[PDB]
Amino acid sequence: MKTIGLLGGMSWESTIPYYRLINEGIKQRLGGLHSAQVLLHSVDFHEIEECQRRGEWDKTGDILAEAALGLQRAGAEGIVLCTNTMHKVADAIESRCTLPFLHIADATGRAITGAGMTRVALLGTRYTMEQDFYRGRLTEQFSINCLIPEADERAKINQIIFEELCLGQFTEASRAYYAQVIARLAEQGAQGVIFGCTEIGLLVPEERSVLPVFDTAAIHAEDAVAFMLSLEHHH
Amino acid sequence: MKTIGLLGGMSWESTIPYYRLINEGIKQRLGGLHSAQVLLHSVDFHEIEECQRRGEWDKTGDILAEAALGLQRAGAEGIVLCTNTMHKVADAIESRCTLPFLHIADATGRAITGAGMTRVALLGTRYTMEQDFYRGRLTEQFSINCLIPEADERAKINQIIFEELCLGQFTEASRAYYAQVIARLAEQGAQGVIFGCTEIGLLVPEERSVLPVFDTAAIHAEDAVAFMLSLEHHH
């Protein structure tokens, strides 16, 4: 199998699901005691998140591209970045590291396409929801349009990510708030909902969403498994 | 902080507790959104476990020493091997990789010493329980003696590790069996019990053991945190 290189700790709480799901996918397909060949670089998220707030995106591109290179030198054969937000600097990683880069939004857009949807709600950090880098790739590459929450809702969704989810706190008050925002975007005509921060699936079970759920972490892990075993779109 | 290099996937089920506990230790000590700088190499356990059964230990030394080198080249500053069994080949890793190697049995023996114990029960794979490499280090370095289960009990403990625990199956029948073996070794005068396979703590909660528990994975993770932050015995 090919060795996958994970760029994680953004936050580490959602890196665990990547590692669990990639190992479980390999076990399911190869059987026995087979497990995944993984190289992981986990950052100190404080530095990354501080750069987000200071607008020092180029510095984060440098940190993550050097990390990807480190994993390549240890034998990684492709790169998975365990965070939607930091695909804002995917270009720096892909420019520097010659490995196949499994873009999280491409895996998600393939899933939404297969569901036959073109108008979906998008929950994530405020960067992912408000800026161009994530939604613009979905529009340009898949002709998928995203509805995002109202400005007050977005502030609260974003505060819950950084002040609770990345700290391991999964409260019913926040769960209910997310579910209410999803229901409101369903009222606005959303066909599905993208859990477009990799921590969101730790808070909101699919049964709590009135919309079909595209969990970016789970879809990205399945993408990595297909790449490692050269299956389906990676054959 | 120093970047820790984890050699894991032996099995991946117990690598998750290392990653969770090391990140939680860093969060507890630095606060905020701080998380651990981790490099992880996760193997396909099938190859390793097959080598165990074939007696191809030198081959596993080669695999793990090359992995440690890969992590060193990516910036690791010390090595943690996430498995008691594979310390049978620690010498190959330490000979080839110049990084500090945080031997799992040293962290455990320091814990047992601090508890003032000299005679403890040892549960693990049959290699760890029956051979010289693990118990002989505890005797030579800490003057700690291990009691191990009777030969039939050892066969079953070992079968449960490989046929259930490494496959994510945690059954009450097996939990109860482990707890009964611990009670019997307590009858034989054991002062504490070493969970000396890193999966055992996933099956047996401490409240189920009649003996004080030395969970090698949890102690090794605390050891790694102290090394990363240059605390206590790593200051």
Q: Do B206 and B222 reside in the same domain of the chain?
A: no
A82 in catalytic set:
no
What is the rounded distance in angstroms from the CA atom of residue B72 to the CA atom of residue B66?
10
Cβ pair A35:B27 closer than 8 A: no
Inter-chain CB proximity B166 and A42 less than 8 Å: no
- Residues B180, B208: contact at Cβ < 8 Å? no
Choosing from A15, A197, A198, A216, the catalytic residue is A197
What is the C-alpha to C-alpha distance for residues A11 and A48, in angstroms, rounded to an integer?
A: 10
Q: Based on the domain organization, do A211 and A111 belong to the same domain? A: yes
Do A207 and A226 share a domain, yes or no? no
| A3, A35, A161: best to mutate for the B interface, most B CBs within 10 A | A35
Is A33 within 8 Å of B45 when comparing Cβ atoms?
yes
User: Does residue A74 contact residue A8 with C-beta atoms inside 8 Å?
Assistant: no
> Do A186 and A227 have their domain in common?
no
What would the two tokens of residue B12 be?
């991946």
CA–CA dist B74, B83 (Å, integer):
22
Q: How far apart are CA B36 and CA A193, in angstroms?
A: 31
Q: Are residues A140 and A91 in the same domain?
A: no
Q: How many Cβ atoms from other residues are within 10 Å of residue B118's Cβ?
A: 13
Distance CA B6, CA A39 (A): 10
**Does residue A216 have an active-site annotation?**
no
Report chain B residues whose CB lies below 8 A from the CB of A73.
Answer: 70, 73-74
Interface A-B, measured as beta-carbon pairs within 8 A, has a size of: 120
Instruction: Check whether residue A91 and residue A21 sit in a common domain.
Output: yes
A53 and A40 in contact (C-beta within 8 Å)?
no
Same domain (yes/no): B185, B223: no
For B8, the enclosing helix (H) or strand (E) is strand B4-8
Cβ proximity of B64 and B81 under 8 Å: yes
Same domain for B10 and B25, yes or no, is yes
Q: Looking at the structure, tell me whether residues A5 and A88 fall in a common domain.
A: yes
From chain A, pick out residues whose CB is under 8 angstroms from the CB of B23: 9, 12, 42
The domain tally of chain B equals: 2
Q: How was this structure determined?
A: X-ray
Residue B199's nearest CA partner among B120, B96, B144, B128 is B128
DSSP string, B193-209: EEE-STTHHHH--GGG-
Helix B12-30 / helix B216-228 crossing angle, nearest 10 deg = 40
Contact A181, A149 (CB under 8 A): yes
Question: Contact B41/B70 with Cβ under 8 angstroms?
Answer: yes
Q: Are residues A67 and A121 in the same domain?
A: no
Domain extent, residue B131, equals 104-215
CATH number of the domain to which B64 belongs: 3.40.50.1860
Contacts of B43 in chain A (CB under 8 A): 35, 37
A110 shares its domain with A69: no
B16 contact partners, CB below 8 Å, separation of at least 6: A16, A19, A20
Closest by CA position to A120, among listed A177, A180, A199, A186: A186
- SS3 for B88? helix
Query: What CA dihedral angle connects A74, A18, B38 and B162, to 10 degrees?
Result: -80
Q: Answer for the pair B57, B89: CB distance below 8 angstroms, yes or no.
A: yes
Residues A9, B36: C-beta atoms closer than 8 Å: yes
The first and second tokens of residue B91, run together, are: 């010498």
Query: What is the Cα–Cα distance from B110 to B115, expressed in whole angstroms?
Result: 9
Closest-CA residue in chain B for A14?
B20
Residue B145: strand, helix, or coil: strand
**Distance from C-alpha of B49 to C-alpha of B35, rounded to nearest angstrom:** 32
Calculated CA dihedral for residues A39, A42, A48, A52, nearest 10 degrees? 60
* Token pair belonging to B4: 């820790």
B184-191 LR contacts (CB < 8 Å, sep 24+): B184/B149, B184/B153, B185/B121, B185/B147, B185/B149, B185/B211, B186/B121, B186/B210, B186/B211, B188/B121, B188/B147, B189/B119, B189/B147, B190/B119, B190/B120, B190/B121, B190/B147, B191/B115, B191/B117, B191/B118, B191/B119, B191/B120
Q: What is the 3-state secondary structure (H, E, C) of chain A?
A: CCCEEEEECCCHHHHHHHHHHHHHHHHHHHCCCCCCCEEEEECCHHHHHHHHHHCCHHHHHHHHHHHHHHHHHCCCCEEEECCCHHHHHHHHHHHHCCCCECCHHHHHHHHHHHCCCCEEEEECCHHHHHCCHHHHHHHHHHCCEEECCCHHHHHHHHHHHHHCHHHCCCCHHHHHHHHHHHHHHHHCCCCCEEECCCCHHHHCCHHHCCCCEEEHHHHHHHHHHHHHCCCHHHC
Interatomic CA distance for residues B44 and B63, integer angstroms: 11
Residue B22 burial (10 A CB sphere; 0-12, 13-18, 19+): buried
Strands of the sheet containing B38-42, edge to edge, are A78-81, A4-8, A38-42, B38-42, B4-8, B78-81
The length of chain B is 235
Looking only at the bridges linking them, the beta strands covering B38-42 and A38-42 are: antiparallel
Answer yes or no: are the C-beta atoms of B190 and B210 closer than 8 Å: no
Measured CA angle at A178 (ends A176, A183), to 5 deg: 90
**Same domain, residue pair B3 and B90:** yes
